Amino acid sequence: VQFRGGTTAQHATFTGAAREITVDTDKNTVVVHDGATAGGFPLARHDLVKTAFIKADKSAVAFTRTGNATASIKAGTIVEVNGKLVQFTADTAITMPALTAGTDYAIYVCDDGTVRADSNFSAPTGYTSTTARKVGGFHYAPGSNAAAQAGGNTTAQINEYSLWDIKFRPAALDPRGMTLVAGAFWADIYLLGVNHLTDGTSKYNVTIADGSASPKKSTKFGGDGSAAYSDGAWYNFAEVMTHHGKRLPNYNEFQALAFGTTEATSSGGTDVPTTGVNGTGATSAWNIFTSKWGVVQASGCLWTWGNEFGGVNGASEYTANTGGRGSVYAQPAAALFGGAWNGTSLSGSRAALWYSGPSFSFAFFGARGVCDHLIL
Amino acid sequence: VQFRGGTTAQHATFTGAAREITVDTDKNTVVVHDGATAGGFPLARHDLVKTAFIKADKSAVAFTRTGNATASIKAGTIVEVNGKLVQFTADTAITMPALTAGTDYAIYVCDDGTVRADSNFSAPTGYTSTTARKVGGFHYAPGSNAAAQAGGNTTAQINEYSLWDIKFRPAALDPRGMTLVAGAFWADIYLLGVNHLTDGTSKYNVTIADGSASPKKSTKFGGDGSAAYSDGAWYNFAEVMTHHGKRLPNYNEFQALAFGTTEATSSGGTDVPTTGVNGTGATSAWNIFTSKWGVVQASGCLWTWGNEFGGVNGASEYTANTGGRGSVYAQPAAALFGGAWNGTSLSGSRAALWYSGPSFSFAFFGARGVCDHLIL
Amino acid sequence: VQFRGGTTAQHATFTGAAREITVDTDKNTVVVHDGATAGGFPLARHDLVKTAFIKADKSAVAFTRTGNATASIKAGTIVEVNGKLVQFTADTAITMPALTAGTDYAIYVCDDGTVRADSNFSAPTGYTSTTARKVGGFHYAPGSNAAAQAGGNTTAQINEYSLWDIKFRPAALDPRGMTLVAGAFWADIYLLGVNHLTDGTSKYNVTIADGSASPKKSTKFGGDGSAAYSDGAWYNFAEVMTHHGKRLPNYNEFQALAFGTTEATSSGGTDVPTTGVNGTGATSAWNIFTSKWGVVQASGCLWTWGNEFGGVNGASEYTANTGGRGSVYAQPAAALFGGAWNGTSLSGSRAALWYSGPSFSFAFFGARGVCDHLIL
Ligand SMILES: [Ca+2]
Numbered sequence A, B, C: 001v002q003f004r005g006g007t008t009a010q011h012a013t014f015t016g017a018a019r020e021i022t023v024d025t026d027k028n029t030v031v032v033h034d035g036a037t038a039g040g041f042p043l044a045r046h047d048l049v050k051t052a053f054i055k056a057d058k059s060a061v062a063f064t065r066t067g068n069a070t071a072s073i074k075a076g077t078i079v080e081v082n083g084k085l086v087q088f089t090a091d092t093a094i095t096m097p098a099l100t101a102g103t104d105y106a107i108y109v110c111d112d113g114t115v116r117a118d119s120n121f122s123a124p125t126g127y128t129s130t131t132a133r134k135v136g137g138f139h140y141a142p143g144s145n146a147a148a149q150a151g152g153n154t155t156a157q158i159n160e161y162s163l164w165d166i167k168f169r170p171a172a173l174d175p176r177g178m179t180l181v182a183g184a185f186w187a188d189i190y191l192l193g194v195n196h197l198t199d200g201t202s203k204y205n206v207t208i209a210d211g212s213a214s215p216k217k218s219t220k221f222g223g224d225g226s227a228a229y230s231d232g233a234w235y236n237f238a239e240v241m242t243h244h245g246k247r248l249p250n251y252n253e254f255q256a257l258a259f260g261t262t263e264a265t266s267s268g269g270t271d272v273p274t275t276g277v278n279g280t281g282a283t284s285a286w287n288i289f290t291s292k293w294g295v296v297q298a299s300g301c302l303w304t305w306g307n308e309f310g311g312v313n314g315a316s317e318y319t320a321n322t323g324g325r326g327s328v329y330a331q332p333a334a335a336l337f338g339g340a341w342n343g344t345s346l347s348g349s350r351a352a353l354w355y356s357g358p359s360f361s362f363a364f365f366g367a368r369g370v371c372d373h374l375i376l
């Protein structure tokens, strides 16, 4: 059976009988008629809804943490995948792989109706990127979020605040390794690593960048992927954050992201070389410094440069201390937040040092990234 | 009549006759054929367009203020609701309830084609949240926006700049009580209240938070809903703004949001206890300080803490004045903007005090929230 | 042939035969049946997908620069236009008009399947805004982006980083004349002009605004379209940026946007009157100062005010220097970035002067706008 048909122009002056269907041959779609409306009611081709993703509560992430190693997709979630409508009318368990501490996972909704996590960010095992659609993810952290203001534990588990979906997520170039602070903005779970080009800015069990272990030079700002900066100036850390679509924290962000850490406490010892791992000679284990949001080594480990200027000024004369990119006059300090391993009682979620010019470089000054929260 | 049908895989190698319809039984949808294209043209199921909201001018809000107590939805607006397409092809009057000064209203598009406002943010009277879809809202203010630079009046009316829709709105956790400043960012209409957990940060006729009436402690940062902060430090006000997905204003934002206030004028008297209400012993009524955008008590009533540091520094020694969250060194002042009731000619949209450290607390220092503008 | 039909309520308790189609006469749509599901599967009317715009890689712009005067739309792009699905399954050349140095172009996808650029931002020549849909655009710059750190050339060409689409774009009120810096945020290609109300903030070959050529007073802040500010205070430039949904750069943004300029070099001579044109008596042509991202006159031409305070403070007394909008106490300097024509070796992507209060006005202090990056 072939329906009556015509071009869009032919349809424009045509009114079909009530409940008659015609085919618009310019559009290759069905047109429903009501006996009254010239041109009828053309229907949508499926490919105009490709990538549809509809949640019942758009103000919250699509997933709920149900236990340390379990999570569900929320009732009322509708997902287009590979030409099909896949939906969930009740909270539905996400099928999990083996989960490994300090690893990011992608959540896929698949055209067979299943929802599954995988460490692979292209496709989950057994599927392709056509049959499995990446819709979100989470961080499987090396320890719990802080329940109060005494840090967290060392039991690996899903960080509920690290759950993201394609419409509830960091406004950074990659969402991995970040956590949502107070529903307001996202912070890197880990201090910036040296190898951030390969690892992203926030990765577990990597060498921390600082004045004596400078980060790789950004490949968006003249780097070749091998060269590192000459030192740990604010300038270099700010440049690295920009590369990744992030920024250094301001004071309002810092006090929020670090809340839950053990206040007035520092790592001790002589160094903090590695993310999510005890410091060298540390008297407090790394988890003492986990925030409510699961920010790791949030205070008392390494100062983070901040995106705010004020405090002690440099000389009231033009000074060429920018790495060959011009001179500065009466340059205010750039903020440093959180304290470092040698800070004893001075460290905490509001610890702030306003002495250091942006050209300064020290083994206890590094960086943590933040970015805005995006709800679509 | 039952159409020929098959699975998606069966369809993949099938080319129907021109204008033939088949049914894909895996997808439960219609497939239109053109006699040429293998697999044909599958059509979209309605639930893949659930929540569709389409405006002719996406760069502007969906509604127009047509009078003090009247507004319309704009021509060209298409809204999915309860399985139906509801649209407006000409500007269409919004059906209003009784409007009460200082109250926020939700705008609903309903599956019967009507558009109506209500003080209830779940459903309008006579409907449910299934038959009525919340698409936006406005503030019915206690007085007019400023026409020039002499404040506003006390005639309750819709604030045109407070109109928001689900794709043109504050990037804060709740849009209520905010206004759009110069099309650029949103500001709280009201100074922060003590009871912000129950009221949100911006509510009419509530007790204003300050150093002598501290805000409720944020329940995202250890609060229980009853306890208040010990004082009115910058730290506490910044924490409260973060709770709500807001921040304190910077200087650029402050001068914009307060433009239209009566400059070089203060409330007078001895206190400003309540939002949108005259101060105690006030020589100027509250409306003298309304901005162009309908920001209430925009200057000359209470200083607002700002999200910027600089000016006078605290001691160049580690100082434990953060409420037990670490120490600060050479701490710059946090900005205070706008002047307060005792400011006489010093107050205004660019009044700025850079003396007070973030630990300071006074009865004339409070806060106002801002956030980014989101157009989707 | 008229299909069986009924209201939505009649459909609710009706289960059609497998592969039967009915018409819902309340919705004017087709309902597909499966012999099992009461109410069947209603299909979407086309107008619920009006404005659909779907890209294969939503993290990148929809277009690729293929040569100095050529560009393509990317494979996998699906566009709703005038009731039709228009798509591209391979990278497809954009049809170009004559291209003129320093001009912004709009890219349209048309209902005949073509994709074309035009200087007209309402419709391309030969089409209307109904048959041609504006989906993005670019800047055809007066010279190349910087390949290293020695500026660019004077060969007019598409600036690849200025490519924007309706889902990958500046979060400013108009996208024209901006470029994406490191994938992170957008900057104005040109310094602010006097006639920004008519031209926008970023336009080629216009008079640059500064203390001796003040910008037009914003019509959102009391301007009439003819009057200019009395001077070039920070306050006035910040107000202008707000008008356009922009802000002045911070230090992190400035060093990023100016990277690629010839460092420690200034224009020379006695003035830089005009955007994208040599300065008066200039010893370096304008293109010496083009950044990697195609920011023109990025350093060494005019200082830009910044959105950051610190450095040298004004008096610790209330001072009425805000243009009649209140007084300031211990007012910190507002940042100035980049150097100016008289800066010799002091200029560069990190040049920063923290001496000038926001009330100061000089012929070598102007402004450049930035804004956030939006990916939808
Ligand atoms: Ca500052």
Ligand SMILES: [Ca+2]
Binding pocket: A307, A308, A309, B307, B308, B309, C307, C308, C309
């Ligand atoms: Ca700042």
